[PDB]
Design a binder for this molecule. Structure first.
Ligand SMILES: *C/C=C1/C(=C/c2[nH]c(/C=C3[NH+]=C(/C=C4\NC(=O)C(C=C)=C4C)C(C)=C\3CCC(=O)O)c(CCC(=O)O)c2C)NC(=O)[C@H]1C
Ligand SMILES: *C/C=C1/C(=C/c2[nH]c(/C=C3[NH+]=C(/C=C4\NC(=O)C(C=C)=C4C)C(C)=C\3CCC(=O)O)c(CCC(=O)O)c2C)NC(=O)[C@H]1C
Ligand SMILES: [Cl-]
Ligand SMILES: [Cl-]
Lengths: 673, 672
């Protein structure tokens, strides 16, 4: 942690106010209201001697006038400018001026310039934009960017350096001409670019160090300013470089550098870092070119990214359509999970899936055991996180004591499904990412004008470390896809159980209907359904002039059967006779049990002679029916016909008298009266 | 069809091979293999005389060598270049050359050039990128684009002109100065820019007409070429303009124009159109500046577009989540539609919603009546589409006879949910008034290519109206609406599951009631008596316990049923069970054994106490209240546990005794 303190001290050095400049130009600082020159870079006289003859040494600038040192166009522009830190570029024959207003000051930088004329720059823009426009993948864009930046700048090494969410970074593309060792995929620490340093790219996108060993030129006071606090030099390019970073570059083996921040809207997403093994200046026009190219390649990379999102979203919809088309074929949600979880593992970039529904747990791929999965589920409920999803890429740290000791899982995405509980679980094995860093960790202290700080490390040689217990983090697009899949499963599960419950409710109500309208011993209609049916048959026949008749029969000398044989045997006979009678009947007829041992048949659409015929078929059916162990059995049948009757008892009385006459005339008979 | 053929004829005029150029430059056509100049523009003499002292007339070029007219860099570059139609730009002190190889020719255009040294272009490029980068919406971007193109080009009218999928177009942004009338939101017909003209932008993104009245300079032959077919001049900037489009611009009040194609990947999405009231040249560098700026504004606009998909998806997910909050609030889906449909109308930019689930219909906002909605539903099933959704922005054309006559509805998005279940999203037809830059004109014009539509004479505003159409249903809305619909399905499914659970609980509980008790009487049904009796016998057989059974029956009960009715007989059964149950001791079990005969199991009761119990029961039914109903009598048999094996034997004994009581005078107690 002493190194944590050392790194934190890096932020102490006020790099925006070094009171010195790099020597590839000069600088004046003027008061706006006073109109006086208050500061001048120590090499000012070798530049402004072009504007004014008398200026041979620095001390001279005290008696010079600004309106003698600057082109009138730059004075007019500065007098006119209201916005601050918006630099104005005005050039002459031999000097190129860059000036801006900052609070009450006019800061003016001057470089040596000579007019070259060509169409080179416009051709480079056309070629760069054509190539960037043709990039359709992440890797293509960044590599074309590295090629263009290298061809334009001539720097011996160019590399795209992407930041992590913790500010550590990695070289993701690289173009090297000379004998540099390749730094592709090497990781660099946050302390390499302090927050103040990263914040500069937001004020000026390009930083230029044309010579790491160029002695910086301090600013000298010339007329006493009203404020005296060091003037902010951040908007320009001449601002002196921290000696810590110069020694860093020396240790890195770099003589000149140029870096351009890569912005995603207002966020610093990375930098284009360019190195040279010898000093190397870049003119204003090449600076503007590199910056415009990187700004263009940037928005192209954001457009490629946002498009890959839309296209993922399409892929998710295609997967959900795949789910519903297979869903309509009577499968359970567990069956659907088994078929598509391999696709889902690709869709969600996870190593395993587990689905919970009731007592059943379905797993595909790498998963914890059932018991640990329930410890997970329980902890999700007991933690009380009502979040639509719960997710972590370092389970061991975000939820300690949750997993077994040696378990390899680090990522969990859990979607709750309402009730009892249900869940969708997405698992990611920890990826034991071996990281290659550019240099050992070096805890070295360095004494500085601000205090004691971390010094730049001396070795940049490859050093590997390993990260365990972590997975890839769960991207937002995957959270929403997983949520959508989970609910598409809930709809399959809901439809399944709705159908099953409808089956159970129909079966239960059907048993309620069976016990209400049938006879326990025989299974034929009980008397209440016969009585009701007969009453409506009478009403119908009287209203609409239909024809029907009834058969009322009884078992003969049946009590002798019960007493000689038994009640178990007697009931087997009643069941037998009902089975034999039902085979004779037509589907229109209704057959039920009227009393003990007495049965009723309602024969609709039947005239009297055909009725007698049916009574004969019934009487003969019970006669010949196979007795097997039990005794032979006989029925005596009475018959009645609809003769404009008022009430159904009148029919039952007629049929009963006929049936009783059948009993007196020899029991095995059909009788009507 | 009358004017339609004329509009289609415009694609006959071969604008790629006019064999002439605009006079703001000069042109050469050289054979690659021959190395000779085979064609040169009619004003080639006043341009190359800058390069060569000797050239005074056009004919002088015949005796010229290309190594005397062209810069060495341009010849080396053309000899070296493999790809065709990729122009090379080489400038000198007084001439600016642009040349490329095409088939077996090298085409070289030359314009007068003055070295202007300044930092202007770099400053404008920086301002353009800073301002475009600060554009965060579609409207800001396109308007900033028009401001930049006007500052850079100096043209008096700049318009962003976007194409329809049918190639008609509309001005969607504009910066217009003093002499011009405003042209914002005016619609132009497809015939204004034929397919060949749109195709040109894919060959060269910028087109320049610096002077509408500048006489075109033909190409003259100079050396006899090997082929003689007209040479294609598409990749350059000097290609002469169709005379129809010149007269077009004249009618438009335009002296000079410039357009830059706006490309989305490879498809032409619109054009940046610029007009001037005077002649107006643009240097090669302002051309490159305008094209680079438009290419940057292009990708920026596509990024804003792709970002607003993402942001939509976020807003939809948030709406579905808001619906899920109500998911754990025990509300119906019809209540949910009522709470949120005003929000959904914004989410889906529709005027009304109707949700059907079962017999129930919920509507919010503008909807047809229930009757029309059902005619719609019916047509949707009889359509039978396997489609996840069904959608139209013009109902009368896509599904005729379906709405009433005077109906205002034109848009429908229908999500099937499954009886029928549907989510319907309704859009009133927007009676969009379109203002066009000129009436339709059926005007013919005779030309060397044939007769085709001539450019219209008036550009004054003319309005027309489109009825029966709404905004079209974007793909993002189809999927969002489907997801809302399914979020409603989960709410309906849960409700239906709760009600089914309640109904199955009530029905299974009534099955339990009927599993052991008798529906009519409330006494134990016969199965429960059979079971109790079997276990009572086994127990008595293990431990030599004493118990008895009483088997009684109603006397002449068939006569009561037939004399009175089904209702009276059952009331008698309930009375007798009520009277008997009050007689019993708490240990005895009483159940209904047959239709008219009942059973009592009296444990811990010997034969005298059993007989006493049978007598109490017989007296209990006799004293019982006849009320409206007839007087009723029971005859009871009695059996005792006498070292029995099975309950079968016992009920047989009791039955014989009971029938013995019936014959000996019905109101009696008997044992046997
Ligand atoms: C305790 C302070 C530390 C420190 C300070 C520091 N570093 C900078 C500037 C830069 N550092 C950069 C680092 C890299 N250059 C590369 O080529 C790569 C790898 C691809 C990395 C990580 C870069 C790029 C800059 C910007 C300037 C440049 O382009 O070289 C500053 C700010 C200096 C300034 O710009 O005035 C400071 C204060 N660096 C440490 O390592 C510790 C010691
Ligand atoms: C039957 C053939 C027709 C025809 C031919 C034609 N038109 C062009 C060129 C252009 N027309 C344009 C139209 C517009 N400019 C605007 O400012 C607006 C309104 C916003 C419109 C609709 C444009 C832009 C061009 C491109 C040239 C330019 O930039 O001005 C061509 C091609 C010309 C050429 O380049 O050779 C042709 C063949 N136009 C008709 O109206 C009928 C007659
Ligand atoms: Cl600069
Ligand atoms: Cl050009």
């Amino acid at each position: 942690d002493d190194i944590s303190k050392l790194i934190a001290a890096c932020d102490q050095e006020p790099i925006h106010i070094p009171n010195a400049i790099q020597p590839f130009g000069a600088m004046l600082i003027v008061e706006k209201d006073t109109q006086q020159i208050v500061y001048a870079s120590a090499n000012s006289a070798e530049y402004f001697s072009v504007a004014d003859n008398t200026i041979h040494e620095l001390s001279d600038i005290k008696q010079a006038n600004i309106n003698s040192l600057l082109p009138e166009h730059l004075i007019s522009g500065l007098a006119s400018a209201i916005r601050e830190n918006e630099p104005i570029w005005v050039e002459t024959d031999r000097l190129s001026f860059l000036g801006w207003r900052h609070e009450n000051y006019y800061i003016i930088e001057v470089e040596r310039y000579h007019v070259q004329t060509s169409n080179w720059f416009e051709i480079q823009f056309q070629r760069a934009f054509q190539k960037l426009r043709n990039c359709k993948t992440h890797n293509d864009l960044i590599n074309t960017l590295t090629r263009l930046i290298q061809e334009i700048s001539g720097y011996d090494r160019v590399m795209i350096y992407q930041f992590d969410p913790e500010w550590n970074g990695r070289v993701i593309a690289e173009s090297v001409r000379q004998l540099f060792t390749s730094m592709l995929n090497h990781h660099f620490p946050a302390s390499d670019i302090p927050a103040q340093a990263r914040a500069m790219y937001s004020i000026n996108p390009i930083r230029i160090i044309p010579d790491v060993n160029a002695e910086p030129q301090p600013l000298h006071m010339i007329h006493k300013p009203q404020n005296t606090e060091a003037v902010n030099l951040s908007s320009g390019v001449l601002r002196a470089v921290s000696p810590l970073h110069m020694q860093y570059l020396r240790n890195f083996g770099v003589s000149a550098s140029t870096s351009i921040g890569i912005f995603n809207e207002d966020e610093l997403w990375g930098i284009v870092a360019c190195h040279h093994t010898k000093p190397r200046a870049i003119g204003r026009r090449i600076r503007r070119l590199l910056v415009r190219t990187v700004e263009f390649a940037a928005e192209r990379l954001w457009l490629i990214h946002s498009r890959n999102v839309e296209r993922y979203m399409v892929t998710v919809q295609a997967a959900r359509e795949q789910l519903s088309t297979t869903a309509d074929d009577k499968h359970s949600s567990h069956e659907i999970v088994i078929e598509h979880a391999a696709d889902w593992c690709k869709l969600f970039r996870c190593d395993g899936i587990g689905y919970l529904r009731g007592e059943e747990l379905t797993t595909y791929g790498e998963t914890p055991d059932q018991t640990t999965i329930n410890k997970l589920v329980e902890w999700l409920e007991e933690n009380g996180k009502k979040s639509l999803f719960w997710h972590s890429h370092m389970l061991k740290e975000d939820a300690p004591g949750l997993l077994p000791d040696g378990s390899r899982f680090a990522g969990l995405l859990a979607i709750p499904l309402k009730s009892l509980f249900s869940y969708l679980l997405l698992f990611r094995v920890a990826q034991n990412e071996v990281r290659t860093w550019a240099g050992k960790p070096e805890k070295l202290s360095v004494e500085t004008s601000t205090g004691t700080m971390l010094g730049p490390r001396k070795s940049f040689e490859a050093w590997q470390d390993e990260v365990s217990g972590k997975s890839q983090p769960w991207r937002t697009a995957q959270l929403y896809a997983a949520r959508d899949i989970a609910r598409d499963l809930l709809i399959v599960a809901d439809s399944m159980q709705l159908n099953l419950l409808n089956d159970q409710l129909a079966d239960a109500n059907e048993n309620l209907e069976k016990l209400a309208s049938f006879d326990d011993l025989t299974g034929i209609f009980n008397r209440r359904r016969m009585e009701d049916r007969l009453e409506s048959e009478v009403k119908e026949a009287q209203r609409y002039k239909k024809q029907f008749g009834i058969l009322l029969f009884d078992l003969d000398k049946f009590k002798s059967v019960n007493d000689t044989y038994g009640h178990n045997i007697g009931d087997q006979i009643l069941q037998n006779t009902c089975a034999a009678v039902s085979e004779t009947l037509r589907d229109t007829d209704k057959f039920g049990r009227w009393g003990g041992e007495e049965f009723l048949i309602i024969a609709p659409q039947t005239g009297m002679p055909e009725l007698m015929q049916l009574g004969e078929r019934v009487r003969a059916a019970v006669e010949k029916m196979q007795h097997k162990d039990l005794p032979a059995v006989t029925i005596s049948i009475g018959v009645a016909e609809f003769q404009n009757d008022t009430r159904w008892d009148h029919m039952i009385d007629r049929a009963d008298k006929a049936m009783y006459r059948a009993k007196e005339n020899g029991r095995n008979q059909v009788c009507s009266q």
